[PDB]
Amino acid sequence: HHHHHHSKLQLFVKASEDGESVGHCPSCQRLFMVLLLKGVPFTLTTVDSQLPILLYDSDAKTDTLQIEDFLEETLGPPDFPSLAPRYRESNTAGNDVFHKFSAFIKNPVPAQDEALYQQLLRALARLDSYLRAPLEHELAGEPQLRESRRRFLDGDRLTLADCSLLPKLHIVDTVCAHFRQAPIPAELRGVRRYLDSAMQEKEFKYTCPHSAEILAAYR
């Protein structure tokens, strides 16, 4: 079904430095994921306003959030699965991780280093607590459940929320690990399980750019 192409729905995304494959771009990956999860035929095209961009008919859409809402609305039951999360909080948890990572990783002030890192950790901590908290349907079946059993944000299936966050969270882990020897702390069991579960899902695994690409983006 799905058609990738370098050198009808069509997604234009960034190519890698050498042009050989998919480039670093967490928004590009987000939409790549949405499209795969819809199970709709599509063409993805790498490129050497701003990407990602989507063509439907002759018509374009250039804004990540807009493209996403469109794909969620236009492609629905019974032809396509809806990917909206069920619970409000799936949409907000970890909403600040990426911003806090970016301020940490770009900081040139020695005396602010630990401080900004702590802010990063605290946000990762809150994401962790949500991932470990049993959701409604989990309790509906098991009334005394203490620790959530689920794989992802909203349950055991990838949703729009995961599509947005996983690409960002992958970068945080990749960059912090390699550059500052600061992998996601083992204490955050829910965050750790979440990244690992994601790597076992074809739609996340096969939309990841090579690690070298992410590393190069940060130098």
Side-chain angles (χ1 to χ4, degrees), residues 2-219:
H2 144 63
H3 180 51
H4 156 219
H5 146 262
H6 88 253
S7 51
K8 267 183 295 182
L9 281 154
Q10 188 187 20
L11 183 63
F12 293 85
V13 306
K14 313 180 175 206
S16 57
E17 285 194 51
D18 64 14
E20 201 148 19
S21 52
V22 160
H24 160 263
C25 176
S27 296
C28 301
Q29 183 177 5
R30 159 176 187 191
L31 299 175
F32 193 166
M33 289 178 70
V34 173
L35 282 159
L36 283 177
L37 292 165
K38 284 295 181 189
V40 64
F42 72 99
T43 295
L44 178 143
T45 305
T46 61
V47 184
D48 280 328
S49 326
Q50 206 191 2
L51 305 175
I53 300 179
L54 176 81
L55 287 194
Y56 195 94
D57 264 59
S58 14
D59 193 306
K61 297 248 202 184
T62 61
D63 312 322
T64 307
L65 185 61
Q66 149 193 35
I67 295 171
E68 190 180 70
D69 291 350
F70 174 71
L71 293 170
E72 172 65 2
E73 193 209 81
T74 287
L75 307 181
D79 261 43
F80 313 95
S82 158
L83 304 181
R86 274 169 302 193
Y87 315 102
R88 168 203 335 116
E89 203 182 343
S90 299
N91 291 113
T92 75
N95 73 19
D96 54 355
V97 163
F98 196 68
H99 170 73
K100 301 287 191 52
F101 152 72
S102 301
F104 160 63
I105 206 59
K106 304 265 159 195
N107 173 56
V109 191
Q112 296 298 138
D113 191 52
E114 272 279 66
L116 283 160
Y117 181 62
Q118 293 301 347
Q119 292 179 35
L120 170 50
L121 285 176
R122 182 74 58 90
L124 282 168
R126 294 185 297 263
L127 175 47
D128 193 57
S129 289
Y130 181 53
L131 287 170
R132 301 234 271 162
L135 302 185
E136 192 165 300
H137 67 275
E138 284 191 296
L139 291 175
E142 197 173 357
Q144 310 150 346
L145 190 61
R146 304 180 199 176
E147 178 92 4
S148 176
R149 308 176 175 275
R150 83 199 187 266
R151 296 187 302 196
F152 306 113
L153 279 176
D154 202 66
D156 288 335
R157 251 194 265 70
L158 294 164
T159 53
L160 290 187
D162 301 292
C163 287
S164 182
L165 182 69
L166 280 166
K168 284 169 173 188
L169 193 56
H170 175 58
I171 299 170
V172 171
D173 194 46
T174 298
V175 178
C176 289
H178 189 92
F179 280 101
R180 309 290 283 96
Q181 287 72 54
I184 310 277
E187 300 84 38
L188 310 185
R189 282 109 126 209
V191 172
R192 289 268 53 158
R193 172 182 89 251
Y194 181 54
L195 288 180
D196 300 359
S197 297
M199 201 51 81
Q200 302 299 299
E201 299 303 310
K202 299 186 161 78
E203 298 86 349
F204 176 77
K205 165 163 178 273
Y206 288 118
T207 68
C208 279
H210 293 140
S211 212
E213 293 296 310
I214 297 162
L215 299 183
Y218 289 82
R219 276 168 152 189

